[PDB]
From Swiss-Prot, chain A:
Annotated source species: Saccharomyces cerevisiae virus L-A (ScV-L-A)
Keywords of the record: Acetylation, Capsid protein, Virion
Coarse class of the protein's main subcellular location: virion
Subcellular locations according to the entry: Virion
Acetylation keyword on record: yes
Gene Ontology biological-process entries: viral translational frameshifting
N-acetylmethionine PTM positions: 1
GO CC aspect terms: viral capsid
Protein's job: Capsid protein self-assembles to form an icosahedral capsid with a T=2 symmetry, 40 nm in diameter, and consisting of 60 capsid proteins asymmetric dimers. The capsid encapsulates the genomic dsRNA and the polymerase and remains intact following cell entry to protect the dsRNA from degradation and to prevent unfavorable antiviral responses in the host cell during all the replication cycle of the virus. Nascent transcripts are transcribed within the structural confines of the virion and are extruded into the cytoplasm. Binds and removes 5' cap structures from cellular mRNA. Forms a covalent bond with m7GMP through His-145 of the capsid protein while releasing the mRNA body.
Name this protein carries in UniProt: Major capsid protein
Amino acid sequence: MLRFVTKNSQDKSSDLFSICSDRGTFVAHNRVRTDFKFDNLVFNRVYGVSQKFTLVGNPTVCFNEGSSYLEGIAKKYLTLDGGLAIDNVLNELRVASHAYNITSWRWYDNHVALLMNMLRAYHLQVLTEQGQYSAGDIPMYHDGHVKIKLPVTIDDTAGPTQFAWPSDRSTDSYPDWAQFSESFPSIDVPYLDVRPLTVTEVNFVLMMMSKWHRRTNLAIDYEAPQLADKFAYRHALTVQDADEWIEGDRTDDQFRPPSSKVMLSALRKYVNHNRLYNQFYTAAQLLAQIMMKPVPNCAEGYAWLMHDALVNIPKFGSIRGRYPFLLSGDAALIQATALEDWSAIMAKPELVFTYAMQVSVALNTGLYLRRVKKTGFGTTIDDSYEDGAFLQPETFVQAALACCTGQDAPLNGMSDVYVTYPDLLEFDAVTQVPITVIEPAGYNIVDDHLVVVGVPVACSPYMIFPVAAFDTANPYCGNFVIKAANKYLRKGAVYDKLEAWKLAWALRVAGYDTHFKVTKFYADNGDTWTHIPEFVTDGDVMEVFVTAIERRARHFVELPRLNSPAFFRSVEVSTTIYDTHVQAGASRINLDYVKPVSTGIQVINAGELKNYWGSVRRTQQGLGVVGLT
Amino acid sequence: MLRFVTKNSQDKSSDLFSICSDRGTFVAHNRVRTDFKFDNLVFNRVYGVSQKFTLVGNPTVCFNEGSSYLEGIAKKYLTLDGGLAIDNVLNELASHAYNITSWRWYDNHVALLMNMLRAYHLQVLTEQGQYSAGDIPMYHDGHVKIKLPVTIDDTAGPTQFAWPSDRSTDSYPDWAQFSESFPSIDVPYLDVRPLTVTEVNFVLMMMSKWHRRTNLAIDYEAPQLADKFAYRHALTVQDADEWIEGDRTDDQFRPPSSKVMLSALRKYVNHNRLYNQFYTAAQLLAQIMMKPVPNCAEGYAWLMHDALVNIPKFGSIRGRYPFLLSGDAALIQATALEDWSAIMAKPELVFTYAMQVSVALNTGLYLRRVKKTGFGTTIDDSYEDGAFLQPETFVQAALACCTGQDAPLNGMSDVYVTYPDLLEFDAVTQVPITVIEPAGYNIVDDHLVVVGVPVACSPYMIFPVAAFDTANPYCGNFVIKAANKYLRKGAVYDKLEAWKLAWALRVAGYDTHFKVTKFYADNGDTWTHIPEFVTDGDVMEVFVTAIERRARHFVELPRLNSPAFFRSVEVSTTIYDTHVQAASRINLDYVKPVSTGIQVINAGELKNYWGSVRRTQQGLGVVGLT
């Protein structure tokens, strides 16, 4: 995850932003300078381009059965090829079978749900103490023309301002827990080791073991039942503050949730003690992938925002506190990527939020990129693009990321886990958008409802600028030249679709709107980005007519008559970012703090694609899932 | 015109057809086999095509005098040019010597010969039993109902050929009998000695004013050719005189039969040696005769448009002196002589040539309009105003641009059949339309409009027509080539290649769509009109989408639209049997003319317009016979 953010070490550094949001949303400002080079002299415009992101979401959770993983177990009981040694654990058990039949049969170690719960609680408490925790509210689209407003399940103003405990006292049951220090396990039941945790951190862990009530519209407050019906924890001291709060003995005031630092320390201690590096890596990946979506500045863009995601979080199971000697020894085949990403998150916890911000934009753009690159602008005859990585729900987000940006998207590192949108597997997926009553201008409104085909572009690429989405030079590349039209006639300046869009974008930045035929280039002011129109994607057309290029009221850098001969000059456009700052209502990272803990940790760089330890690579032939090498 | 008709197909064929009408219209049926050879798999489909024609028309005729032509007199009575040898005449015979100083020699009988031609054709038509007023066909296509008006109603219209004039209701020429050697008045006289009594009667009485009584194009109105004249005959003929003074009843004095009328024509021409003037008369009659009935809806603008004809005023010096027609006839064109021999061998050469010239004229005008844009033609020649300005070379230029061979010129100066309102490419027509159901049609205010000239016929009376330099459906055969580029939804195609592909698929049985929607092709002709949108400029590529099949399908073909399934389909079309229905093959070796007693010149004079116009590579232009 860290390498993806740093673009494989851009000058061995990158930048991060902490989580901040008001009313469930936050703007993401930018400052850029766009050049215009014609007549061998340079003009420029410095403009502020913003981008709205929202934390509001309602994903569908699926706490179904999942496989077991024993990576953070001592090297002498695990093995790369020999796997789990049941003979060694029976010998060291201290007949054998008499313990086998009791509990030694399950072997269902998996804490992904617990780690995800602790992470989302940390994020929610961060928002709480920043004075910004509240019920979500999706923004409205006021543009004089057709207006969009969406509902929320919980009202913002009545919504809670404080992150209380997820579960509600005196309404639902809790898992039955009791401290357990016996060497010999007695009941087949998850045993989780929390020995080195303080009273408050172990209290927080076992309280988050309970079930989760949703009290807000945010995407990370999803519903979650109790991870285990019964369980026991390996701790020297018997903790019952949570138990006292379960009954009326402890009041709400005296059992307030801890501060963000305490939850972060609890998570660090838990993962370090149980050697849960890969499991936490998967948990962070999933939480970031479900974190948020970008608020569109166009009308048809909200169709992407209407969709809800489906997540496969595995059912919880912990065999690490059953036997004290499991963790005695260096951990077995811990992935190097997991170690470095874990060190990066623990050093800077905002890395997960920044990666979520990058991944939302990359995925939303890459879905459009794949719906276009399948047909290749309609000059691909067969189906030899091999976009099949989009099919299996696990490599959905990874394939979208790889298609949008050339970088290797990081696989989830875990089997039967994914974040997927089932209804958007196919690119000819129609969506309906509830729409208020205002006269139209060619937004193909049907029965007072925007009909949207496929998935729309809903964000500017200004947080991943070198995206290289297209092969040719374009605004996504950043620097491009504007060439003369293919041939000039009465209708005017036959232009190829992609080059026509490039010209339209450059003129819209420069202050001239353009008129097309087979009518203008509806864009956004705040975000002077002009999203690619449907004439590029439809593939029925290959040349387009630009009739007239007019002057907007907000004039800017002056250009000649581009759409006519003897007056056109081959201007070229280059933009650079001056200042970016995610405000609402930064922290530099370099590869100096990446150095992971290698003391008593066996590290394998190689991975097997069966467990999804790899990275999907986009090539010209198409996407492709590649191992970690 | 014999060379033109016998060269449209081959020197051996020489196929002729007789005149036939069915309420003024007739249909010419054909039977044509189309091949489809690809991957050494020859496929074919035999089908019948029908192109109907109409004889109904209302041409405008102007009777304006022109040059005087004397190319039938003896050698000694002519100078080095067409002017008569007045000194030789006088040294042969006085007051006349002094009178001559005031005797202009205007001898031109083209109006008379044309009148006899149209009267003969009308009599043939009425003895065939189908002469009538003539009515335009009523075309209806499920979406649009059209019916062009005609002046004379068919039902009340006469069924028998009445004499063109009335019962002494109008004045008649003051004819006279001449037998002396002294012309008394500068008024023209004729020499009709070899003619019989009834032939002379028909000639003199038809000289009188002609009235238009039917919608037939050859039944145009014409005034009396001369107020006064005399005929040099052995005896006075006065039966038509008794008819005008109101003595001979209609039953005994009726228009003569076709045979005797043609015999009068023959005697007149070959005694006065009017081969050149008769050739001009036949040319004009052929160019005015008929038009094709359009299968497509918008093609009726061709029907509504009326030609303009310039017939010279009637004048005669043949009958003034009796020795002029003696001696060796001088300055007779070989083409005129052979055409005369052929038409008197069979009198329906004029009809078949008229049908061919009608089809060629329509196609030539339409292909001039199309090739203006740049469709099929490399050079942007001055198709608009080059050789179409000269009214006498208008129809010949159209024929040359259509067919590619040498169109025969009128052979006479200041005579033409010209459409003045057709030189512009912006000319519009308001065809009346009762629209049945709305569809793709530019219907504004009860009349659709057309631009320029439309297609109203199909190139089947003349099939091997070489309209374009490259292979095309107009040519015998063409090879469908690979598309310029293939896309997901289809492939782009050049204008001409796309039209060739669409034509071949329509013959095979596939309906072809395109964008920037249908390639129109009516049943009963299965010829695909050039699409309107691709006709204009600034369009060089056509996107072909959705090559769907039709209800009836004959030859099963590859897609030719997808790169995987495209195959080099080579087509070939040949016409096997034609039969008009309201042969008659000619034999050149038996119709060869009389070379004795006639002086024949191969060459002509460009002033008199004795030549032909050929579509050169660099541009069509008039050339001499040499």
